[PDB]
Amino acid sequence: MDHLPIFCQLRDRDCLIVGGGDVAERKARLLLEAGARLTVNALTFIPQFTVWANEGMLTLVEGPFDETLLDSCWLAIAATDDDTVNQRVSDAAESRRIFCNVVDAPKAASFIMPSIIDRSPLMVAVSAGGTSPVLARLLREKLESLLPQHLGQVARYAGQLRARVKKQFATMGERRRFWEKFFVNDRLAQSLANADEKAVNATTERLFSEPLDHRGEVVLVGAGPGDAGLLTLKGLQQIQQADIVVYDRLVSDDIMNLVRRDADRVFVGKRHCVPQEEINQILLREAQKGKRVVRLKGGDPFIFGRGGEELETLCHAGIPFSVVPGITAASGCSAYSGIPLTHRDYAQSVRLVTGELDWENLAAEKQTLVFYMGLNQAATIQEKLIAFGMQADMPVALVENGTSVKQRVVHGVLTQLGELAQQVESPALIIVGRVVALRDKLNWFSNH
Amino acid sequence: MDHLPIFCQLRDRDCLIVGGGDVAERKARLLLEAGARLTVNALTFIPQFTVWANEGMLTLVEGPFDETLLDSCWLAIAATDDDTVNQRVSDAAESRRIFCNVVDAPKAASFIMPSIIDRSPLMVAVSAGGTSPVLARLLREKLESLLPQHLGQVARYAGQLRARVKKQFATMGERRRFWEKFFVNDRLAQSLANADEKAVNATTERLFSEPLDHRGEVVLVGAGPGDAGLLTLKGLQQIQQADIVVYDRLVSDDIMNLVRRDADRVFVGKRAHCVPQEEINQILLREAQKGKRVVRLKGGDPFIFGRGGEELETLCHAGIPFSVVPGITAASGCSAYSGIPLTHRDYAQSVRLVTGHLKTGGELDWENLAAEKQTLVFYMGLNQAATIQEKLIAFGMQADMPVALVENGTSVKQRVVHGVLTQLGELAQQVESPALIIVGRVVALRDKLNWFSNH
Ligand SMILES: Nc1ncnc2c1ncn2[C@@H]1O[C@H](CSCC[C@H](N)C(=O)O)[C@@H](O)[C@H]1O
Ligand SMILES: Nc1ncnc2c1ncn2[C@@H]1O[C@H](CSCC[C@H](N)C(=O)O)[C@@H](O)[C@H]1O
């Protein structure tokens, strides 16, 4: 990120604003509303400032810019119509290692004022670094309507129960459950809104008198083939609130960037890859500790992932679990590669596969084949397929990193299969079938 | 307002972190993605720190808190489990007017670290002042799914167009509506993240070329088996930006509640009269020509027994841009929500998705399907359940073969029924559409993997 957002406590803290026009006035209005000890240096002031000045809410210094005026500040803001004077303020501020903003110059200085969506104590800030001011405004707009006008009341109240909540529940599991039940409560939200104390207390007491569960859980979550956009809503939700996430190398970084920031992350791969057993053990141990475990697996956990293996003992262990399906590689890759898995007469049967496996059955057709881990076996596949009677002219396709910005699709025919497979590395998916034909009549993702 | 939110430029700026544990490691990761010139002072560090240090990412200062270590500091964060030590780091940071955060004491020092949605350079932050950390993740979450992944791309890219935009658009409101269309054009955003220069120019041009009010395109989107939770982020992002939504009966009521208040809807499924496919294909092509952002909402997955290809092969010349957002297909959903994995250790070597009979044009392949190591998943076979029981054990499938049926999978009224092949047609007159027929030994796994409620 090119900016780190932080929420500063400016109470009884000095801040300086240079410039006394309308721009400066808007900024000053924000700092006062944050309770800063504000001083304003300007050549001329517009009414407002004086109003504040004789209302003792700030200090005014009429006259040219004075670098020493920064010596006791936490924040500096240059808002004059004079760019030369502005960078004198910025340079002064930097020598003093004070964060500073030059409003009409967003690439300069050391910080930018984001657009604010107030719902105290709850606040949302949005910005583009000065690159897309129309993007921020549109966003603030969408956000203004998206956040309930009284959402602050609930947050405020939450902080006040914060104390009784810890004393009523031993574990994190019950408190985490408390708030979840709490921020979903409309009667409460409504109650708070109508300053109806009776309804608030009634609902509050019941929440405390509730027998919340203390045990943890393990959740299998399909991460999809790679494109973070293919994660399900429920999936995003799981990694957004998990205490520990167990991911392998088939989970794209983009997807990893969606995980809760304050969560533990265990890599279960080719550091080997922690045999199955070692992965399983980790899970139940983490859930045992009453944690919210999330086993993030590529594609869909129940279609080739040892998803079941990872669960088939948790019930004997009394540990809660659930599964969140994801887009299988075959699903995404096919779609992203302009190849539908089924069409008008082509297939009435789709196959997901993998000295091995029934070639006569696979050879047959009015089917479309999708081999999951046959890259180092691609060669013998065409030999066997052709051997057991599959048309040499039959089109085939390979997809490496399907769904990713790095997607790569090689195309050809059975005879070229083995060759092609060398034109690609892992992870790659092999699709055999008449449906590959209509790839560039439907290809939309990339030209590579 | 109690906290003023500000966005800091930390690239190559001195920031100090006191602490070397996991809490310290998260703040460092963040500070690092922000480009801070990071120094971490702690008694002991966890592996992650040595890595970073052993790769010139940051500086380590193993030992007790060194106050001089703040002398040229811009930011400080107290991440130690010792409140007295933290209290000292906080006192030292304020003594020299330095914004300091004390991880476990939100209203203790100068600033609070917000929850962050990164779409750099577009960034959103959420905070309740340490009153409701939980409400913040709830909000982080909502915003994360609402903002498409590559938004930053079009944000960075806008500047290179700002010029052409004023040239061509003289009225403020015009330029504004342009940006509105530009910022929600996810195809372009993808072409940019795809480093697909041609498509970037193709798409950029179209934007100016086409009439301002036109946003013509077609998006095939998989709705999932029913649960609005099985919808993909992208799919939701699309459904919120639709001008018109063409949808069918297998798209959940709950998913529809997510479609833009007043974007026209067009029901094309079975009505209490069936709509011909070419008419549907034609509504798509035609309405995108009228310059409307069309989204064909499909039950489950677009290219899996959904006739999704056809609705697209018709768009290759109308010159209409199109894309496909895959969805969770019925098999995947019913599998996960029934406790019947489609593959397991031995049981596992060919998952087969096949169609029953309202979809004909030839005849079925019985001994192909009868094999011994595949998991058969039948779509639309409820009406041929007996015809499949008889013709299956007929071609060798062991009658004691476990089978199951999953109706309204993933839904709150999901029904799962199971047993042995010799009961298929019987357990079928026990379900209604839509359902799937799963034949395979993996069905027995449900004894240990059932977790969803049954109806
Ligand atoms: N993103 C991807 N791109 C191409 N192939 C993939 C892939 N993800 C998985 N595969 C194929 O499947 C193998 C891993 S097994 C996991 C499959 C995943 N559960 C799914 O449902 O798709 C890889 O070796 C590769 O051959
Ligand atoms: N939620 C659901 N639960 C159980 N079966 C379902 C289902 N949704 C669809 N099906 C099965 O799929 C058939 C329609 S064919 C369309 C399938 C869709 N494209 C997909 O990807 O799943 C239905 O008749 C039924 O057999």
mmCIF file of C-alpha atoms in Angstrom, chain A residues 69-327:
data_model
loop_
_atom_site.group_PDB
_atom_site.id
_atom_site.type_symbol
_atom_site.label_atom_id
_atom_site.label_comp_id
_atom_site.label_asym_id
_atom_site.label_seq_id
_atom_site.Cartn_x
_atom_site.Cartn_y
_atom_site.Cartn_z
ATOM 1 C CA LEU A 69 5.202 27.868 14.769
ATOM 2 C CA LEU A 70 5.709 24.158 14.093
ATOM 3 C CA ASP A 71 8.020 23.417 17.038
ATOM 4 C CA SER A 72 5.240 22.008 19.234
ATOM 5 C CA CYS A 73 3.036 20.333 16.627
ATOM 6 C CA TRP A 74 1.867 16.817 15.804
ATOM 7 C CA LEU A 75 0.239 17.787 12.502
ATOM 8 C CA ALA A 76 0.852 20.449 9.869
ATOM 9 C CA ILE A 77 -1.395 21.477 6.995
ATOM 10 C CA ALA A 78 -0.502 23.968 4.277
ATOM 11 C CA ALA A 79 -3.590 25.482 2.646
ATOM 12 C CA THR A 80 -2.537 28.732 1.015
ATOM 13 C CA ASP A 81 -3.059 29.822 -2.588
ATOM 14 C CA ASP A 82 0.748 30.141 -2.657
ATOM 15 C CA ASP A 83 2.610 26.943 -3.599
ATOM 16 C CA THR A 84 5.964 28.475 -2.700
ATOM 17 C CA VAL A 85 4.806 29.264 0.841
ATOM 18 C CA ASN A 86 3.228 25.811 1.017
ATOM 19 C CA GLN A 87 6.447 23.894 0.435
ATOM 20 C CA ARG A 88 8.161 26.157 2.948
ATOM 21 C CA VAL A 89 5.653 24.756 5.412
ATOM 22 C CA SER A 90 6.170 21.206 4.177
ATOM 23 C CA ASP A 91 9.966 21.492 4.377
ATOM 24 C CA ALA A 92 9.740 23.031 7.826
ATOM 25 C CA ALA A 93 7.425 20.229 8.937
ATOM 26 C CA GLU A 94 9.685 17.489 7.661
ATOM 27 C CA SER A 95 12.823 18.786 9.411
ATOM 28 C CA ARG A 96 10.700 18.385 12.527
ATOM 29 C CA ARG A 97 9.400 14.940 11.548
ATOM 30 C CA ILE A 98 5.828 16.126 11.825
ATOM 31 C CA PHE A 99 3.284 14.551 9.466
ATOM 32 C CA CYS A 100 2.176 17.234 7.019
ATOM 33 C CA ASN A 101 -0.392 17.748 4.261
ATOM 34 C CA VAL A 102 -0.398 20.171 1.303
ATOM 35 C CA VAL A 103 -4.010 19.971 0.136
ATOM 36 C CA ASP A 104 -3.610 21.205 -3.451
ATOM 37 C CA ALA A 105 -0.523 19.031 -3.781
ATOM 38 C CA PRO A 106 -1.476 15.388 -2.867
ATOM 39 C CA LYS A 107 1.788 13.830 -4.044
ATOM 40 C CA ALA A 108 3.801 16.148 -1.844
ATOM 41 C CA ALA A 109 4.457 16.174 1.906
ATOM 42 C CA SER A 110 3.795 13.129 4.097
ATOM 43 C CA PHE A 111 0.023 12.563 4.472
ATOM 44 C CA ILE A 112 -3.355 13.139 2.818
ATOM 45 C CA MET A 113 -6.731 13.942 4.338
ATOM 46 C CA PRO A 114 -9.084 11.082 3.459
ATOM 47 C CA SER A 115 -12.799 11.528 2.937
ATOM 48 C CA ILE A 116 -14.690 10.796 6.155
ATOM 49 C CA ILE A 117 -17.914 8.938 6.960
ATOM 50 C CA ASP A 118 -18.709 9.788 10.568
ATOM 51 C CA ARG A 119 -20.733 7.480 12.813
ATOM 52 C CA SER A 120 -18.852 8.114 16.053
ATOM 53 C CA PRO A 121 -17.351 6.320 17.624
ATOM 54 C CA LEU A 122 -17.359 4.364 14.348
ATOM 55 C CA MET A 123 -15.539 5.895 11.414
ATOM 56 C CA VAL A 124 -14.742 4.999 7.822
ATOM 57 C CA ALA A 125 -12.095 6.770 5.712
ATOM 58 C CA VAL A 126 -11.527 6.464 1.961
ATOM 59 C CA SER A 127 -8.914 7.918 -0.392
ATOM 60 C CA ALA A 128 -7.004 7.453 -3.621
ATOM 61 C CA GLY A 129 -3.835 9.368 -2.802
ATOM 62 C CA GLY A 130 -4.978 12.144 -5.115
ATOM 63 C CA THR A 131 -5.024 9.830 -8.116
ATOM 64 C CA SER A 132 -8.780 9.370 -8.326
ATOM 65 C CA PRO A 133 -10.585 12.084 -6.318
ATOM 66 C CA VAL A 134 -13.803 11.179 -8.187
ATOM 67 C CA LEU A 135 -13.312 7.610 -7.036
ATOM 68 C CA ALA A 136 -13.172 8.663 -3.391
ATOM 69 C CA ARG A 137 -16.209 10.957 -3.632
ATOM 70 C CA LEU A 138 -18.307 8.279 -5.262
ATOM 71 C CA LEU A 139 -17.170 5.867 -2.600
ATOM 72 C CA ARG A 140 -17.926 8.204 0.298
ATOM 73 C CA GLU A 141 -21.354 8.618 -1.238
ATOM 74 C CA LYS A 142 -22.005 4.876 -1.490
ATOM 75 C CA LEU A 143 -20.667 4.497 2.040
ATOM 76 C CA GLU A 144 -22.810 7.276 3.489
ATOM 77 C CA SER A 145 -25.961 5.436 2.485
ATOM 78 C CA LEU A 146 -24.575 1.974 3.259
ATOM 79 C CA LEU A 147 -23.939 2.732 6.949
ATOM 80 C CA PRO A 148 -27.053 3.122 9.142
ATOM 81 C CA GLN A 149 -27.366 6.659 10.517
ATOM 82 C CA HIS A 150 -27.360 5.359 14.098
ATOM 83 C CA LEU A 151 -24.744 2.648 13.847
ATOM 84 C CA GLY A 152 -22.673 4.787 16.237
ATOM 85 C CA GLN A 153 -25.117 4.155 19.092
ATOM 86 C CA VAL A 154 -24.518 0.393 18.925
ATOM 87 C CA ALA A 155 -20.732 0.757 18.779
ATOM 88 C CA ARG A 156 -20.878 3.187 21.658
ATOM 89 C CA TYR A 157 -22.943 0.766 23.685
ATOM 90 C CA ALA A 158 -20.648 -2.118 22.747
ATOM 91 C CA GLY A 159 -17.714 -0.370 24.378
ATOM 92 C CA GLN A 160 -19.660 0.046 27.594
ATOM 93 C CA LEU A 161 -20.509 -3.650 27.944
ATOM 94 C CA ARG A 162 -16.924 -4.421 27.084
ATOM 95 C CA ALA A 163 -16.230 -4.694 30.831
ATOM 96 C CA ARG A 164 -19.178 -6.826 31.902
ATOM 97 C CA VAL A 165 -18.674 -9.064 28.880
ATOM 98 C CA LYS A 166 -15.212 -10.168 29.939
ATOM 99 C CA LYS A 167 -16.395 -10.874 33.475
ATOM 100 C CA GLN A 168 -19.367 -12.954 32.334
ATOM 101 C CA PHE A 169 -17.545 -15.253 29.902
ATOM 102 C CA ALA A 170 -14.276 -17.068 30.489
ATOM 103 C CA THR A 171 -13.198 -17.681 26.862
ATOM 104 C CA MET A 172 -12.694 -15.708 23.646
ATOM 105 C CA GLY A 173 -15.169 -18.056 22.017
ATOM 106 C CA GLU A 174 -18.115 -16.840 24.050
ATOM 107 C CA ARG A 175 -17.161 -13.173 23.779
ATOM 108 C CA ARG A 176 -16.642 -13.558 20.038
ATOM 109 C CA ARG A 177 -20.099 -15.170 19.961
ATOM 110 C CA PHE A 178 -21.534 -12.510 22.236
ATOM 111 C CA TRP A 179 -20.668 -9.617 19.899
ATOM 112 C CA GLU A 180 -21.748 -11.583 16.821
ATOM 113 C CA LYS A 181 -25.182 -12.125 18.331
ATOM 114 C CA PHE A 182 -24.968 -8.493 19.512
ATOM 115 C CA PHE A 183 -24.214 -6.622 16.273
ATOM 116 C CA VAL A 184 -26.828 -8.676 14.451
ATOM 117 C CA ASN A 185 -29.545 -7.668 16.915
ATOM 118 C CA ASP A 186 -32.061 -5.363 15.235
ATOM 119 C CA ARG A 187 -34.399 -5.070 18.174
ATOM 120 C CA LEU A 188 -31.379 -3.792 20.090
ATOM 121 C CA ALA A 189 -30.306 -1.504 17.236
ATOM 122 C CA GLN A 190 -33.853 -0.255 16.944
ATOM 123 C CA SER A 191 -34.178 0.063 20.710
ATOM 124 C CA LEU A 192 -30.970 2.114 21.042
ATOM 125 C CA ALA A 193 -32.267 4.343 18.238
ATOM 126 C CA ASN A 194 -35.485 5.112 20.077
ATOM 127 C CA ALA A 195 -33.634 5.795 23.341
ATOM 128 C CA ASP A 196 -36.048 3.225 24.800
ATOM 129 C CA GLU A 197 -33.985 2.041 27.783
ATOM 130 C CA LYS A 198 -36.413 -0.704 28.775
ATOM 131 C CA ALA A 199 -36.117 -2.555 25.478
ATOM 132 C CA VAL A 200 -32.337 -2.142 25.522
ATOM 133 C CA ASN A 201 -31.879 -3.617 28.988
ATOM 134 C CA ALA A 202 -34.302 -6.472 28.352
ATOM 135 C CA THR A 203 -32.453 -7.636 25.268
ATOM 136 C CA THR A 204 -29.101 -7.012 26.932
ATOM 137 C CA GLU A 205 -29.772 -9.115 30.010
ATOM 138 C CA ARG A 206 -31.008 -12.029 27.925
ATOM 139 C CA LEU A 207 -27.826 -11.979 25.852
ATOM 140 C CA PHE A 208 -25.811 -12.263 29.059
ATOM 141 C CA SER A 209 -28.019 -14.956 30.490
ATOM 142 C CA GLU A 210 -27.370 -17.022 27.359
ATOM 143 C CA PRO A 211 -25.374 -20.284 27.367
ATOM 144 C CA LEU A 212 -22.858 -19.569 24.648
ATOM 145 C CA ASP A 213 -20.574 -22.316 23.358
ATOM 146 C CA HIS A 214 -16.896 -22.397 24.291
ATOM 147 C CA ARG A 215 -15.601 -25.024 21.851
ATOM 148 C CA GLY A 216 -13.778 -24.162 18.645
ATOM 149 C CA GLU A 217 -14.205 -25.476 15.111
ATOM 150 C CA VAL A 218 -12.549 -26.419 11.845
ATOM 151 C CA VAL A 219 -13.897 -25.195 8.549
ATOM 152 C CA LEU A 220 -12.830 -26.501 5.146
ATOM 153 C CA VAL A 221 -12.917 -23.601 2.736
ATOM 154 C CA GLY A 222 -12.626 -23.862 -1.035
ATOM 155 C CA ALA A 223 -10.356 -21.028 -2.135
ATOM 156 C CA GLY A 224 -11.087 -21.509 -5.794
ATOM 157 C CA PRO A 225 -8.476 -21.842 -8.583
ATOM 158 C CA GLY A 226 -6.686 -18.565 -7.881
ATOM 159 C CA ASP A 227 -8.630 -15.439 -8.877
ATOM 160 C CA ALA A 228 -9.611 -13.960 -5.480
ATOM 161 C CA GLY A 229 -12.891 -12.959 -7.091
ATOM 162 C CA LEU A 230 -13.973 -16.612 -7.285
ATOM 163 C CA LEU A 231 -14.002 -17.007 -3.517
ATOM 164 C CA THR A 232 -17.543 -17.354 -2.146
ATOM 165 C CA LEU A 233 -19.120 -14.801 0.124
ATOM 166 C CA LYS A 234 -19.226 -17.338 2.951
ATOM 167 C CA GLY A 235 -15.613 -18.178 2.224
ATOM 168 C CA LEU A 236 -14.438 -14.582 2.495
ATOM 169 C CA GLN A 237 -16.432 -14.458 5.685
ATOM 170 C CA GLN A 238 -14.600 -17.441 7.211
ATOM 171 C CA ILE A 239 -11.113 -16.114 6.546
ATOM 172 C CA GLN A 240 -12.288 -12.679 7.649
ATOM 173 C CA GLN A 241 -12.945 -13.922 11.169
ATOM 174 C CA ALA A 242 -10.739 -16.968 11.739
ATOM 175 C CA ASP A 243 -8.145 -17.191 14.509
ATOM 176 C CA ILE A 244 -5.834 -19.459 12.555
ATOM 177 C CA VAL A 245 -5.683 -20.303 8.859
ATOM 178 C CA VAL A 246 -4.061 -23.460 7.456
ATOM 179 C CA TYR A 247 -3.226 -22.864 3.812
ATOM 180 C CA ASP A 248 -1.275 -24.752 1.189
ATOM 181 C CA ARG A 249 0.485 -23.523 -1.948
ATOM 182 C CA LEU A 250 -2.636 -23.844 -4.084
ATOM 183 C CA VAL A 251 -4.143 -20.827 -2.338
ATOM 184 C CA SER A 252 -3.293 -17.669 -4.277
ATOM 185 C CA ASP A 253 -1.623 -14.753 -2.503
ATOM 186 C CA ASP A 254 -4.446 -12.475 -3.603
ATOM 187 C CA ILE A 255 -6.717 -14.822 -1.730
ATOM 188 C CA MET A 256 -4.326 -14.837 1.222
ATOM 189 C CA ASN A 257 -4.521 -11.044 1.314
ATOM 190 C CA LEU A 258 -8.175 -11.475 2.236
ATOM 191 C CA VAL A 259 -7.490 -13.283 5.476
ATOM 192 C CA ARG A 260 -8.042 -11.581 8.853
ATOM 193 C CA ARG A 261 -4.882 -9.533 9.568
ATOM 194 C CA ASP A 262 -4.613 -10.532 13.201
ATOM 195 C CA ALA A 263 -4.747 -14.268 12.472
ATOM 196 C CA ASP A 264 -2.157 -17.073 12.667
ATOM 197 C CA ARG A 265 -1.069 -18.621 9.341
ATOM 198 C CA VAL A 266 0.300 -22.141 9.016
ATOM 199 C CA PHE A 267 1.775 -23.210 5.690
ATOM 200 C CA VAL A 268 1.058 -26.859 4.943
ATOM 201 C CA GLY A 269 3.317 -27.475 1.979
ATOM 202 C CA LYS A 270 6.614 -27.702 0.071
ATOM 203 C CA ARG A 271 8.790 -25.895 2.520
ATOM 204 C CA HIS A 272 7.980 -31.897 2.932
ATOM 205 C CA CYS A 273 4.451 -30.837 2.830
ATOM 206 C CA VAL A 274 3.525 -32.081 5.995
ATOM 207 C CA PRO A 275 2.155 -35.398 5.495
ATOM 208 C CA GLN A 276 -1.490 -35.699 5.809
ATOM 209 C CA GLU A 277 -1.187 -36.795 9.152
ATOM 210 C CA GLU A 278 0.721 -33.909 10.316
ATOM 211 C CA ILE A 279 -1.816 -31.515 8.780
ATOM 212 C CA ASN A 280 -4.775 -33.306 10.301
ATOM 213 C CA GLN A 281 -3.192 -33.197 13.745
ATOM 214 C CA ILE A 282 -2.599 -29.458 13.541
ATOM 215 C CA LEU A 283 -6.289 -28.835 12.902
ATOM 216 C CA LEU A 284 -7.892 -30.760 15.768
ATOM 217 C CA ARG A 285 -5.195 -29.432 18.083
ATOM 218 C CA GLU A 286 -6.020 -25.861 17.155
ATOM 219 C CA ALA A 287 -9.740 -26.427 17.434
ATOM 220 C CA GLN A 288 -9.170 -28.244 20.741
ATOM 221 C CA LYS A 289 -7.717 -24.983 22.002
ATOM 222 C CA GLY A 290 -11.168 -23.589 21.188
ATOM 223 C CA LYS A 291 -9.948 -21.707 18.140
ATOM 224 C CA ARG A 292 -11.745 -20.999 14.897
ATOM 225 C CA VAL A 293 -9.702 -23.036 12.467
ATOM 226 C CA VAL A 294 -9.999 -22.656 8.732
ATOM 227 C CA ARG A 295 -8.426 -25.142 6.371
ATOM 228 C CA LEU A 296 -7.972 -23.166 3.157
ATOM 229 C CA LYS A 297 -7.591 -25.467 0.168
ATOM 230 C CA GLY A 298 -7.365 -24.664 -3.545
ATOM 231 C CA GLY A 299 -10.355 -25.284 -5.815
ATOM 232 C CA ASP A 300 -13.061 -27.255 -3.950
ATOM 233 C CA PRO A 301 -12.078 -29.254 -0.816
ATOM 234 C CA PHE A 302 -14.226 -32.292 -1.615
ATOM 235 C CA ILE A 303 -13.098 -32.715 -5.251
ATOM 236 C CA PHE A 304 -9.428 -33.794 -4.759
ATOM 237 C CA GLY A 305 -8.097 -32.253 -1.592
ATOM 238 C CA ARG A 306 -7.985 -34.682 1.261
ATOM 239 C CA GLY A 307 -10.867 -32.682 2.658
ATOM 240 C CA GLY A 308 -12.666 -35.715 3.982
ATOM 241 C CA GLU A 309 -9.468 -37.092 5.482
ATOM 242 C CA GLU A 310 -9.140 -33.849 7.387
ATOM 243 C CA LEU A 311 -12.628 -34.195 8.852
ATOM 244 C CA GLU A 312 -13.289 -37.923 9.266
ATOM 245 C CA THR A 313 -12.226 -37.962 12.933
ATOM 246 C CA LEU A 314 -13.363 -34.599 14.281
ATOM 247 C CA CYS A 315 -16.787 -36.023 15.134
ATOM 248 C CA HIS A 316 -15.088 -38.729 17.181
ATOM 249 C CA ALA A 317 -13.282 -35.779 18.732
ATOM 250 C CA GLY A 318 -16.427 -33.752 19.469
ATOM 251 C CA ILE A 319 -15.144 -30.884 17.332
ATOM 252 C CA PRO A 320 -17.578 -28.771 15.252
ATOM 253 C CA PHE A 321 -16.878 -28.463 11.556
ATOM 254 C CA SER A 322 -18.451 -27.420 8.277
ATOM 255 C CA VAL A 323 -17.482 -27.123 4.645
ATOM 256 C CA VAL A 324 -17.501 -24.230 2.267
ATOM 257 C CA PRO A 325 -17.271 -25.393 -1.365
ATOM 258 C CA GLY A 326 -15.160 -23.499 -3.875
ATOM 259 C CA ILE A 327 -14.825 -23.293 -7.625
#
